[PDB]
């Protein structure tokens with residue numbers, strides 16, 4: 001069964017670095033495009049970035065300065081090394097596969113399987 | 126007439142050359158006004174066949 005599990009959220013100080021995981025099961029990244037999307041408490045889903053199968057990375061151009069998406073194909077997992085987390089970086093971070101091959105429904109977000117997402121908050125303590 | 130008779134000189138007379146056709150001024154498409162997308166997703170993404 002295709003299932004995406006994220007881990008690594010929690011409290012994090014301002015100006016620090018925090019690494020997130022997208023340990024995937026049921027499929028491999030050798031033939032699929034994978035995306036990271038955030039979700040504010042008061043705003044909608046905001047696309048962060050995308051990792052292609054050949055290693056090609058694209059990011060949100062208002063968020064390029066502080067995100068990094070990498071793979072570990074031996075452990076078939078996706079990594080997100082975020083740095084300098086400020087107050088507006090408090091989000092629930094979903095990891096999802098891109099449905100490039102087929103479009104069964106007219107999906108606004110263009111993804112066929114989602115992750116449960118992990119919640120990250122930035123405050124004093 | 127020169128093109129129809131395949132000659133650069135045309136003798137005296139009347140010659141049927143082509144047929145005049147009124148040109149279509151607009152294009153009209155008339156389909157039923159139904160708007161609900163058709164559930165092919167139920168057919169093609171079903172768990173069991």
Ligand SMILES: *[C@@H]1O[C@H](CO)[C@@H](O)[C@H](O)[C@H]1NC(C)=O
Nearest residue numbers: 104105112113166170171172
């Ligand atoms: C297709 O089916 C899978 C599992 O049966 C489901 O996860 C996916 O969301 C479905 N796609 C659409 C467009 O409903």
